[PDB]
Coordinates of C-alpha atoms and ligand atoms in Angstrom, one line a residue:
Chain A
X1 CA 0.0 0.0 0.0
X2 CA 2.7 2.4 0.7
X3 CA 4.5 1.4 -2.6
X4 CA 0.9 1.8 -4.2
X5 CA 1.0 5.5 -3.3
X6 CA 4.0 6.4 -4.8
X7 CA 2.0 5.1 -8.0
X8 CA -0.8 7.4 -7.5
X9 CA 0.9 9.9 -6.8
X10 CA 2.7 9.5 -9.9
X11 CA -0.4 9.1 -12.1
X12 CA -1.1 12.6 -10.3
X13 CA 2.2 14.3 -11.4
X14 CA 1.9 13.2 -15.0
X15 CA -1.9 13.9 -15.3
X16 CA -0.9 17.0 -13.8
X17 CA 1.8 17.8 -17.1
X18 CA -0.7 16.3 -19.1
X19 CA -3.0 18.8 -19.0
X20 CA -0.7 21.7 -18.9
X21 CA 1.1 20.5 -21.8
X22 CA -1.6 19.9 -23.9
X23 CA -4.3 22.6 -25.0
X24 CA -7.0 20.2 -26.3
X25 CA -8.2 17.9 -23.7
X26 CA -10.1 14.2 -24.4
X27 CA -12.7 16.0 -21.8
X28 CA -13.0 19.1 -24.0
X29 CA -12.9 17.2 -26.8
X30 CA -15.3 14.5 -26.4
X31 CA -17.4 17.8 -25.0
X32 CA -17.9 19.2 -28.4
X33 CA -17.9 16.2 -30.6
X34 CA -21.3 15.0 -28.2
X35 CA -22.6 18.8 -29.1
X36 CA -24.5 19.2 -25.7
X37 CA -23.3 22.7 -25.5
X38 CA -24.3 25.9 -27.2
X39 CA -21.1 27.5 -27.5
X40 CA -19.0 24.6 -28.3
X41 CA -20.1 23.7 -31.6
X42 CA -17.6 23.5 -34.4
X43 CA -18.3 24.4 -38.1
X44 CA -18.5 21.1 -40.0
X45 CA -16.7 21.2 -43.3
X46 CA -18.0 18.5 -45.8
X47 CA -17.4 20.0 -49.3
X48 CA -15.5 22.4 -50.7
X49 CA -17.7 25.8 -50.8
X50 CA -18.3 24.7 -46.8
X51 CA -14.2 24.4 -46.4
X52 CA -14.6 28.0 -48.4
X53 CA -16.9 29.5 -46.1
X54 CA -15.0 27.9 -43.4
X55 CA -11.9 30.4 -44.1
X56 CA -14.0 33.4 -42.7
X57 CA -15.0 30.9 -39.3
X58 CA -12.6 29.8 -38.4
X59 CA -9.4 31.4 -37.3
X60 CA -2.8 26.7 -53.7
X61 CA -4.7 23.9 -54.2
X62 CA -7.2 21.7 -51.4
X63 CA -5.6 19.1 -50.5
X64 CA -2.2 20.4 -50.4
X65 CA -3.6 23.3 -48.0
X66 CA -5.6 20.6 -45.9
X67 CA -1.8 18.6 -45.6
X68 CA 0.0 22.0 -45.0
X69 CA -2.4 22.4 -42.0
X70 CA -1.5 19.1 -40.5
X71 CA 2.2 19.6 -41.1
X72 CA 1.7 22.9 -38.6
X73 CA -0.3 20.9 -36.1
X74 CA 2.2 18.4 -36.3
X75 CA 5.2 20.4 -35.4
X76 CA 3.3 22.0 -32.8
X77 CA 2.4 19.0 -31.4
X78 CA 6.6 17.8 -30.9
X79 CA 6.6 20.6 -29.3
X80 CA 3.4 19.9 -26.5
X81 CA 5.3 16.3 -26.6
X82 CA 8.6 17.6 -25.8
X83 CA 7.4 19.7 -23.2
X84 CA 5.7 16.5 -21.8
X85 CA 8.5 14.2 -21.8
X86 CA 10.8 16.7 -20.1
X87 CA 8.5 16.5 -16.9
X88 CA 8.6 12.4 -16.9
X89 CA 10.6 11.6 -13.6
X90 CA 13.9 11.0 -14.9
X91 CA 13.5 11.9 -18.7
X92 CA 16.0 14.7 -18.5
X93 CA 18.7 12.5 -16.4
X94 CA 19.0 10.5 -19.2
X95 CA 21.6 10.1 -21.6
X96 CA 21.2 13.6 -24.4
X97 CA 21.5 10.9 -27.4
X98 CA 18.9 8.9 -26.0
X99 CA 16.4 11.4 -25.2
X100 CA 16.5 12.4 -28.9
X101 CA 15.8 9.1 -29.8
X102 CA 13.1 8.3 -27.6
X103 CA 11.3 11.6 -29.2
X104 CA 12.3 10.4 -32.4
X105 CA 10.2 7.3 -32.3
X106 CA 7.7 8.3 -29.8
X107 CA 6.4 11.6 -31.1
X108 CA 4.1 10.3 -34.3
X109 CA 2.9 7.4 -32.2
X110 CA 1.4 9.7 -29.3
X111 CA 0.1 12.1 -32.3
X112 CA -2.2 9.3 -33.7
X113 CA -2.4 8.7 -29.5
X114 CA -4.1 11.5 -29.1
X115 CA -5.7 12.5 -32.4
X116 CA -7.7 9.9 -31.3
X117 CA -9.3 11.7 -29.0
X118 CA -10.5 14.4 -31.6
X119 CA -12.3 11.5 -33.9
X120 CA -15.7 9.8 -33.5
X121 CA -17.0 7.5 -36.9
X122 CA -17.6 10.6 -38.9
X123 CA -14.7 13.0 -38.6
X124 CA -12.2 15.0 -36.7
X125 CA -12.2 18.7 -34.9
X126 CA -9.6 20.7 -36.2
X127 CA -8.4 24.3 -35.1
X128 CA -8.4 23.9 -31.8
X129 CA -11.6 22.4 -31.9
X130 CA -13.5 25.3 -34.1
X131 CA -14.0 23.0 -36.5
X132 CA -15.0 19.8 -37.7
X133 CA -13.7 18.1 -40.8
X134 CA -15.9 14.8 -42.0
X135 CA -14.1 11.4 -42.5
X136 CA -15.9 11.6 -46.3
X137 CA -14.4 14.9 -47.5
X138 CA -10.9 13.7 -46.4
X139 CA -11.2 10.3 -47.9
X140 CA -12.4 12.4 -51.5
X141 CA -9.2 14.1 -51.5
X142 CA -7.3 14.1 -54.6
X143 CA -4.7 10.9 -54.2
X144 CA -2.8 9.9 -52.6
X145 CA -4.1 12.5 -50.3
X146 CA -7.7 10.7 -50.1
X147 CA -6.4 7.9 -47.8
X148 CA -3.8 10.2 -45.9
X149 CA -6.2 9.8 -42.9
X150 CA -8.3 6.8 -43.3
X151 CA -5.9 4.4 -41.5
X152 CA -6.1 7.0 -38.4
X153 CA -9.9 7.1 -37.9
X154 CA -9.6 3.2 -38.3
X155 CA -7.7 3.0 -35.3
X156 CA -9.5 5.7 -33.5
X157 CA -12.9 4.3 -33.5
X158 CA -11.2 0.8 -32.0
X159 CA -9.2 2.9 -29.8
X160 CA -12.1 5.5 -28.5
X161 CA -13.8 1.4 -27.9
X162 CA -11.4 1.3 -24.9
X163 CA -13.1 4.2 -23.1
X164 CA -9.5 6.1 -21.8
X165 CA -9.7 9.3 -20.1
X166 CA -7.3 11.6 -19.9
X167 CA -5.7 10.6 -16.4
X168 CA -5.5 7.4 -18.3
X169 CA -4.4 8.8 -21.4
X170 CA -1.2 10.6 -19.6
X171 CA 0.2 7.5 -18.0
X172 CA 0.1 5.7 -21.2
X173 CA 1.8 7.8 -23.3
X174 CA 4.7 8.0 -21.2
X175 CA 5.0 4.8 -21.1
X176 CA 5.3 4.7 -25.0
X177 CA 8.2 7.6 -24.9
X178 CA 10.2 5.3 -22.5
X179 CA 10.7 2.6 -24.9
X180 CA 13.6 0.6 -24.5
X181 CA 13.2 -1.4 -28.0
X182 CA 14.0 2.1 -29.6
X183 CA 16.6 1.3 -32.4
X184 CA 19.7 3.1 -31.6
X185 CA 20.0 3.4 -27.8
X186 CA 22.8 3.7 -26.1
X187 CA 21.5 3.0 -22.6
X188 CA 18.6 0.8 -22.4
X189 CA 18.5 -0.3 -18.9
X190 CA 18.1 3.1 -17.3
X191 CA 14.9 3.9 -19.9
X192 CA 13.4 0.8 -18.7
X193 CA 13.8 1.1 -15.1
X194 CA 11.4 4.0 -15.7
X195 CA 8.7 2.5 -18.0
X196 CA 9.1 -0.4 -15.5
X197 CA 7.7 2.2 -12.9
X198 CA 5.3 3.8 -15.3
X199 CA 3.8 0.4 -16.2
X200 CA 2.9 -0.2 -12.4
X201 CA 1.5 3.3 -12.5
X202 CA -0.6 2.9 -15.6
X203 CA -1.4 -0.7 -14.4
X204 CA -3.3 0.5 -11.1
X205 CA -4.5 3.8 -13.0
X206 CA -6.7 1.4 -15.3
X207 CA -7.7 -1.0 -12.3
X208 CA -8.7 1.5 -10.2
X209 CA -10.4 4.0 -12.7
X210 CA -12.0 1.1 -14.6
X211 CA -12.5 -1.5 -12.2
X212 CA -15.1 -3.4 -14.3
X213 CA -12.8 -3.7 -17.5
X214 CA -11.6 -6.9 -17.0
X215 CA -7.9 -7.0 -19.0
X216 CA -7.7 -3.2 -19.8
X217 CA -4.5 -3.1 -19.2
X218 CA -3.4 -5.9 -21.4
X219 CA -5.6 -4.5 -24.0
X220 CA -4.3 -1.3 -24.1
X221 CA -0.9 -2.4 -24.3
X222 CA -1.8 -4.3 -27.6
X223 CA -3.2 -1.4 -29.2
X224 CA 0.7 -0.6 -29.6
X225 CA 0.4 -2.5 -32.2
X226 CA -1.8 -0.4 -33.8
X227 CA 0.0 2.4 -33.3
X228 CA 3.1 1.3 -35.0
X229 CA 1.0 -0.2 -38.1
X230 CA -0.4 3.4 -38.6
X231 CA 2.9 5.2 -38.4
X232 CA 4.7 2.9 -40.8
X233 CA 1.7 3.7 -43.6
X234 CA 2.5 7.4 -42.9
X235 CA 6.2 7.3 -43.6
X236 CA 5.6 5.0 -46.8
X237 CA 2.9 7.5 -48.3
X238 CA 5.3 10.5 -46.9
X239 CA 7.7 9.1 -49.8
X240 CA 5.4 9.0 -52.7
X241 CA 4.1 12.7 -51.9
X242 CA 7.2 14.0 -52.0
X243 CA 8.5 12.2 -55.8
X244 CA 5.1 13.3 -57.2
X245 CA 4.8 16.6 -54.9
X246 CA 8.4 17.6 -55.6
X247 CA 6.6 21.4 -55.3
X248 CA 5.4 20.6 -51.7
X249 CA 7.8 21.7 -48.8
X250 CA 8.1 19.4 -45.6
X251 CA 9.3 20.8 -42.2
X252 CA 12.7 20.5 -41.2
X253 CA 12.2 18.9 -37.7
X254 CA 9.6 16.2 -39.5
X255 CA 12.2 15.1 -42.1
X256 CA 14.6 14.8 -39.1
X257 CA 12.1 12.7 -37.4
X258 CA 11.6 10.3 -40.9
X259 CA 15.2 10.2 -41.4
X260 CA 16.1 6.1 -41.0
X261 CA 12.9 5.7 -39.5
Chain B
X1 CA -11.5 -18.2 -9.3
X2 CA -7.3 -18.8 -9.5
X3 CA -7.9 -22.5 -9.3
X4 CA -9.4 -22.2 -13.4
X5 CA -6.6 -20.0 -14.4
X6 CA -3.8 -22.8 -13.0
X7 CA -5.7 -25.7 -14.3
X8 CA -5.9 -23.7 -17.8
X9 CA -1.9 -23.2 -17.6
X10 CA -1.3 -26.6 -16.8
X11 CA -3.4 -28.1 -19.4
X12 CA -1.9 -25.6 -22.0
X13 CA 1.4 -26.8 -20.8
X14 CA 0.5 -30.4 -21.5
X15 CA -0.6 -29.6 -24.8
X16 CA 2.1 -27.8 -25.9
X17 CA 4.6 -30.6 -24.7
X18 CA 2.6 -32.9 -27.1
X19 CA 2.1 -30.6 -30.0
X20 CA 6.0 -29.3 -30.0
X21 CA 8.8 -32.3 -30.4
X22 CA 11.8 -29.6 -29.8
X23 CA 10.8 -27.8 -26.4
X24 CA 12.5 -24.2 -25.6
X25 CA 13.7 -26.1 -22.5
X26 CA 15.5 -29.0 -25.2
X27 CA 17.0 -26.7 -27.5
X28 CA 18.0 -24.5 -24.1
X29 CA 20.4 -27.0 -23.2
X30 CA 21.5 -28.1 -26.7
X31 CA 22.6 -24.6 -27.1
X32 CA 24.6 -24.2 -24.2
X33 CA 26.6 -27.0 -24.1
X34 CA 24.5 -28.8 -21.5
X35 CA 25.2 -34.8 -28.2
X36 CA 26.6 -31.8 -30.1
X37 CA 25.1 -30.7 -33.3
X38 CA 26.6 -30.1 -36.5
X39 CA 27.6 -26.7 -36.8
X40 CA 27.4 -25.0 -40.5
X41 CA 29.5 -21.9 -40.7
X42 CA 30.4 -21.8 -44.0
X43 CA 29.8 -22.9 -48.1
X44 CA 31.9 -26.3 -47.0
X45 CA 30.4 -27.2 -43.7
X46 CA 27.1 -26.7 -45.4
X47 CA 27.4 -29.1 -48.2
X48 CA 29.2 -32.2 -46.0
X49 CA 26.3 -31.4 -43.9
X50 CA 23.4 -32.2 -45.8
X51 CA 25.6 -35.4 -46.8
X52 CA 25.3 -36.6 -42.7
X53 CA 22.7 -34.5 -41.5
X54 CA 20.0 -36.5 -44.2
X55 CA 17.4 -33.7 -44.8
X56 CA 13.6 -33.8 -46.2
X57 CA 14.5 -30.1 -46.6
X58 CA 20.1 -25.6 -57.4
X59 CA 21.7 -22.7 -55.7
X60 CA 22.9 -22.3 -51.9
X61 CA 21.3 -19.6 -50.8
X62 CA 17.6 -20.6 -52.6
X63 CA 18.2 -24.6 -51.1
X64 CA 18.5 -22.7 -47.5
X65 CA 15.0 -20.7 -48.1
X66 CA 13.3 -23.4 -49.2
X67 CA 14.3 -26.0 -46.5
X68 CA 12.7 -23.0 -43.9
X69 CA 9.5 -23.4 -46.2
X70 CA 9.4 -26.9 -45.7
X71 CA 9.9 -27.1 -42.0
X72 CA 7.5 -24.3 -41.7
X73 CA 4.5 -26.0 -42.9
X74 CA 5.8 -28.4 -40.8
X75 CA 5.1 -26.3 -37.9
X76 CA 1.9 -24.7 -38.9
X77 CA 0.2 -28.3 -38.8
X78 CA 1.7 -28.8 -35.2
X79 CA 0.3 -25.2 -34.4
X80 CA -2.8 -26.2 -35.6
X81 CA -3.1 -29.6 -33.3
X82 CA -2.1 -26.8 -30.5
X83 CA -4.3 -24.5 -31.1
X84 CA -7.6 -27.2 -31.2
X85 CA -6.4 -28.0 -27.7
X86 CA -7.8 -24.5 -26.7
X87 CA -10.6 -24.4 -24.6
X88 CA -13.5 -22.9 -26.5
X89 CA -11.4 -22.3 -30.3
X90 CA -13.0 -25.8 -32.0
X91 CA -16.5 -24.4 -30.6
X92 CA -15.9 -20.8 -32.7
X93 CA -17.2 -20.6 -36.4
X94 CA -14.9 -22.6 -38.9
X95 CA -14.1 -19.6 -41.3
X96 CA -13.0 -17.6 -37.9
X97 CA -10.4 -21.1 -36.7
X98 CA -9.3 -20.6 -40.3
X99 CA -8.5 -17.0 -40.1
X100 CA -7.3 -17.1 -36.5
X101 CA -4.8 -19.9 -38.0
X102 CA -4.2 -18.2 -41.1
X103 CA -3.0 -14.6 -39.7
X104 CA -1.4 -16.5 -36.6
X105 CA 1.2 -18.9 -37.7
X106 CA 3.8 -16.7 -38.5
X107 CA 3.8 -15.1 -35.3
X108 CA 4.1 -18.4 -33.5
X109 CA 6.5 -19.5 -35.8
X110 CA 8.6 -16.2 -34.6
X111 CA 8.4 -16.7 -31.3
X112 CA 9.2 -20.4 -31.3
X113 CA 12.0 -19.4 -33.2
X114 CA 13.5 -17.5 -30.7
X115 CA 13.6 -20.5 -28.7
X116 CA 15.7 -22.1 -31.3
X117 CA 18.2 -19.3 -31.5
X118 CA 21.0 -17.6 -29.9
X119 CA 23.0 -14.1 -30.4
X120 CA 25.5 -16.6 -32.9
X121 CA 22.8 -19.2 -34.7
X122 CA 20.4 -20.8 -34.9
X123 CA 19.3 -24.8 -34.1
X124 CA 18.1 -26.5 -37.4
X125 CA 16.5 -30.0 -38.5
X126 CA 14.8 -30.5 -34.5
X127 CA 18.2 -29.6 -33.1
X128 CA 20.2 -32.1 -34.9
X129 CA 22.0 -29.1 -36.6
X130 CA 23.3 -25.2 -36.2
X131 CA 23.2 -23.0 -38.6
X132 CA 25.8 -19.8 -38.0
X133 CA 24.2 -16.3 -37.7
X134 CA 27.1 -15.2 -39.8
X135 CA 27.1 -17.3 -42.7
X136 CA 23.0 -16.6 -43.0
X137 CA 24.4 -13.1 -43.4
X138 CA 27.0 -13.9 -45.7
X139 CA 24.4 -15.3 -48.3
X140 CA 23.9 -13.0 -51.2
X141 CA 20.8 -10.4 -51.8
X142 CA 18.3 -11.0 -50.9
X143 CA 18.8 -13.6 -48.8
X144 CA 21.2 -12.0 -46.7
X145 CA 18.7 -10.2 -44.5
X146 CA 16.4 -13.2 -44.1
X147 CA 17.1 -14.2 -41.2
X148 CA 19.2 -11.4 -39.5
X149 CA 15.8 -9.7 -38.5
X150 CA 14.1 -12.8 -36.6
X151 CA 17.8 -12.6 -34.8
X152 CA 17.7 -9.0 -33.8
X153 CA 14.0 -10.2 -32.2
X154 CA 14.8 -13.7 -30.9
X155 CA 18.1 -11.7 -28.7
X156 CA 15.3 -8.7 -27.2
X157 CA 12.8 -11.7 -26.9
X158 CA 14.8 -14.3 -25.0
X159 CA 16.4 -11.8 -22.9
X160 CA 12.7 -12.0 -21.5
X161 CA 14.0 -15.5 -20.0
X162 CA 10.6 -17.2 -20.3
X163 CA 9.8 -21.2 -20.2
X164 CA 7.8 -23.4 -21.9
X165 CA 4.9 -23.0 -19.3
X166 CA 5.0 -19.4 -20.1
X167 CA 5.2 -19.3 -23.9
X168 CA 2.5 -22.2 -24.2
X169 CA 0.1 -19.4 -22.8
X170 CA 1.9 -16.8 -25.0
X171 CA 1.6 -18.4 -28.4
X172 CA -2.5 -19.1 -27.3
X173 CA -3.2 -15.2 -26.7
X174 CA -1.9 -15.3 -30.2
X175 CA -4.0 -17.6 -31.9
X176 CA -6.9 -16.0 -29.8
X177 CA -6.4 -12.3 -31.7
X178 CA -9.5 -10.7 -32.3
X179 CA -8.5 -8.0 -34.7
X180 CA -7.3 -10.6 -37.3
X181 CA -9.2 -9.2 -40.5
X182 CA -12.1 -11.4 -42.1
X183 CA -13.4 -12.4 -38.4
X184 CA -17.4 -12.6 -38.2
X185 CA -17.3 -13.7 -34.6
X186 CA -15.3 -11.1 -33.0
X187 CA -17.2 -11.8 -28.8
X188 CA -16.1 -15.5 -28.3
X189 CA -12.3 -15.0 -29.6
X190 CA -11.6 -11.8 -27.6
X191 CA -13.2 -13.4 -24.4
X192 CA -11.3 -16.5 -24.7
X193 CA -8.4 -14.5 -25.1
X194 CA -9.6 -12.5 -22.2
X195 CA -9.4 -16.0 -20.3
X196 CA -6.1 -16.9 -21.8
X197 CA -4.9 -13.3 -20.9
X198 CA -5.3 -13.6 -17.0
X199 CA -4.0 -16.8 -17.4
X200 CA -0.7 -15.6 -18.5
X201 CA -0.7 -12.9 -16.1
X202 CA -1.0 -15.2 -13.1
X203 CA 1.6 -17.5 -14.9
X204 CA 4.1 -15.2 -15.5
X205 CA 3.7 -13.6 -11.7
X206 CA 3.9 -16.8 -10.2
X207 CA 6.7 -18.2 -11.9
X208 CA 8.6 -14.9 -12.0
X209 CA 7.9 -13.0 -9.0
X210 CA 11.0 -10.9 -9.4
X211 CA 10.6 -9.9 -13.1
X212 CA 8.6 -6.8 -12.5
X213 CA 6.1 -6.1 -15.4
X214 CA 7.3 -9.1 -17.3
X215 CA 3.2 -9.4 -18.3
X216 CA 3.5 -6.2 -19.9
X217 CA 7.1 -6.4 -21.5
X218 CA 5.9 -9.7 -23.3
X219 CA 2.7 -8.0 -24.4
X220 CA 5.2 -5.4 -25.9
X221 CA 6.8 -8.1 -27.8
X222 CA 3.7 -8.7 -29.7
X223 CA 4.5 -5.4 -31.4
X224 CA 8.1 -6.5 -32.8
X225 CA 6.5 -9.7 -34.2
X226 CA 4.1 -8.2 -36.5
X227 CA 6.8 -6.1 -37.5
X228 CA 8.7 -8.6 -38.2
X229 CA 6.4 -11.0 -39.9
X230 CA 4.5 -8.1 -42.4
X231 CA 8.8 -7.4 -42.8
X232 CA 9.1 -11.0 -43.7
X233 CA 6.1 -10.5 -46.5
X234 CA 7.3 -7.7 -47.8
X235 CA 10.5 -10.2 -48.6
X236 CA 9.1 -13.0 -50.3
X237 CA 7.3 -10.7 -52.9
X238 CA 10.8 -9.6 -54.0
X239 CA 11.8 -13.2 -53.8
X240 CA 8.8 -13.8 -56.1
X241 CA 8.9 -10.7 -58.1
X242 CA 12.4 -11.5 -59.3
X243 CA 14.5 -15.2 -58.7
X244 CA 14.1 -17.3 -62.0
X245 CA 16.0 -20.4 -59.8
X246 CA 12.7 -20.1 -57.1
X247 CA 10.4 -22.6 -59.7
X248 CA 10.0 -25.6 -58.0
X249 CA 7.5 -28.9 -58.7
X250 CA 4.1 -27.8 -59.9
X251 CA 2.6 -29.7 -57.3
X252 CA 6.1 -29.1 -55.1
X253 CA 4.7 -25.2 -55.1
X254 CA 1.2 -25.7 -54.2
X255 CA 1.9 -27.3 -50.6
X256 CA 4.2 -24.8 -49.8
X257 CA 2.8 -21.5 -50.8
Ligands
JJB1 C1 11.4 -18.3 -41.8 C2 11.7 -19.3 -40.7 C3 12.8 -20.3 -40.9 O1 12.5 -21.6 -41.0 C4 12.0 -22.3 -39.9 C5 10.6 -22.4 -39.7 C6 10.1 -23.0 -38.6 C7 11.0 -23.5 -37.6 C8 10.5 -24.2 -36.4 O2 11.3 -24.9 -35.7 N1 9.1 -24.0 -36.0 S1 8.5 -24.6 -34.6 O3 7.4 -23.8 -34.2 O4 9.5 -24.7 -33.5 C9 7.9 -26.3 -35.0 C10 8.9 -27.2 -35.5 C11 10.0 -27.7 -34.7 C12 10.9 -28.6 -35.3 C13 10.7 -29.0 -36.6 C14 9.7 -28.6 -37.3 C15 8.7 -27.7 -36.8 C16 12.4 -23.4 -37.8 C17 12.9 -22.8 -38.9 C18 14.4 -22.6 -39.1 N2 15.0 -23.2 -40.2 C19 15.3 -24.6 -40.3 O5 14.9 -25.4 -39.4 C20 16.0 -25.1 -41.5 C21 16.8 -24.3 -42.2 C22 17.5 -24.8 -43.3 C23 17.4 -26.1 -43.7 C24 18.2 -26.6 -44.9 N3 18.0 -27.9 -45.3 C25 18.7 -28.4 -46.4 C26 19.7 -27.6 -47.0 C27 19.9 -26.3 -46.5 N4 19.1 -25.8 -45.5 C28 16.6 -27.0 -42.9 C29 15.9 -26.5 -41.8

């Protein structure tokens, strides 16, 4: 019991980040995709002359716009993730070459983590939650830009199935920076020490929050999976955008994070 | 409610004693030194070894590929007796046994690989050979990477230190995968797995009591196999898309496709 609250409190230090880290919350998320409120609602956009209109709402050609746009969120979100991992106990006590790498592979898989948590069956909210993009207007796109985000929302709806919060949510992607099965790493043991710790944590987070989901745990960890699937289709259709899109600029920090992925 | 999850270890245990001639705990002490194989190491040790080693198992590096195909089918029928020893898989649909089979035995294969292998080879022919991890390297494009990436697993998987008891739970809460694509009956599958799941976790706790989180480093693992296996497809289409020498038997080619 006494080495039981060192895990809470834990779970409460990295909920804690969580939320100061990251603008968009699950809770103010799944608060405007349900539409209860009045003030909350999001502009759908579902064609083009309601993307048009959606210029003036919310604050080249289509589809190269639309990917532009998630290139900026993208980059924005390494730096929410950064900011994150830097308050993991122990993060910044690590070896410099290894933190790199642990971003490296950990960013893109708490991305599709967390975009997740902006998706239902029929879309994603976009802007900061101002708007809402459906799943059909992104899988029309002009190729290979039409399936760009299918392979997300698959996930997401199998994902959203598990019913995570965001305490939950914090504990969990910790544990997926701390990854000692990161290719290039020069010391393992010390990174695993720590997702050892963060496991426990998550482990009696999930029992404790969702005491009626028998093997939560278990099948949360297998949704790894999943996540790895989804970020290997990225980089694959990253490298037939840019040999057909050779007009199409990528961002520096990205291409550093695809490099010898 | 523990005395079901035992009796379900135990009886998987049994099963997979039955099912699998060359345990982990076998090939363990064939590896260590613990009746000596016949080690292959290079293009000379290989030939005067299929001259005494007497294999069902043109070209070198194509003879080597082929004699994996033909002990893999091998195993895929043993997986299958294995996995109808499952409580509750022979009473699921028959297109969903298929498909759980199908997208399933090359991640067993994998992992009962490891068991075979060490950071320097790997046991062939039911542990009556050793193939070098350097000469499998030495082979020419693209043969040369065949193998090395089941090694780079098999070293972070062992490392894991688990038993037969353990991995005869393991290689069920494969079979019993309920995201396998095709399934019509998705309930029964994830809540045998479910089953198998707190099965392994009480397995793995009780047997290794000082391996913190060992339930959840495995479960980990599961990640690195698909990798490697959709990395091992990815393979044998550029071994079919090119490779003349690969035409076998007409009927040779339609057992082991
Ligand atoms: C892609 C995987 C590689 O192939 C394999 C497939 C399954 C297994 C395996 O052991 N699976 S298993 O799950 O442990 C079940 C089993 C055990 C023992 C015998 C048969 C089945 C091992 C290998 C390992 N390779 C061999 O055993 C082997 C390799 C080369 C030759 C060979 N023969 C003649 C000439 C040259 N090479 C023969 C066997």
């Amino acid at each position: 019991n006494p080495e039981s609250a060192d895990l809470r409190a834990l779970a409460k230090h990295l909920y804690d980040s969580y939320i100061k880290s990251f603008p968009l919350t699950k809770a103010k998320a799944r608060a405007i995709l349900t539409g209860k409120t009045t003030d909350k609602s999001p502009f759908v956009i579902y064609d083009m002359n309601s993307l048009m209109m959606g210029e003036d709402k919310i604050k080249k050609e289509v589809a190269i716009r639309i990917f532009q746009g998630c290139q900026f969120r993208s980059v924005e979100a390494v730096q929410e993730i950064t900011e994150y991992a830097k308050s993991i106990p122990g993060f910044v006590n690590l070896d410099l070459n290894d933190q790199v790498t642990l971003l490296k592979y950990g960013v893109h898989e708490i991305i599709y983590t967390m975009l997740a948590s902006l998706m239902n069956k029929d879309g994603v909210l976009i802007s900061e939650g101002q708007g809402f993009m459906t799943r059909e207007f992104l899988k029309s796109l002009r190729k290979p830009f039409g399936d760009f985000m299918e392979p997300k929302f698959e996930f997401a709806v199998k994902f959203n199935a598990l019913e995570l919060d965001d305490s939950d949510l914090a504990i969990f992607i910790a544990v997926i920076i701390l990854s000692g099965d990161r290719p290039g790493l020069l010391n393992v043991k010390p990174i695993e020490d720590i997702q050892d710790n963060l496991l426990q944590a998550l482990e009696l987070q999930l029992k404790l929050n969702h005491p009626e989901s028998s093997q939560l745990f278990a099948k949360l960890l297998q949704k790894m999976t999943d996540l790895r699937q989804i970020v290997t289709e990225h980089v694959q259709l990253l490298q037939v955008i840019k040999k057909t899109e050779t007009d199409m600029s990528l961002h520096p920090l990205l291409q550093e994070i695809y490099k010898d992925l």
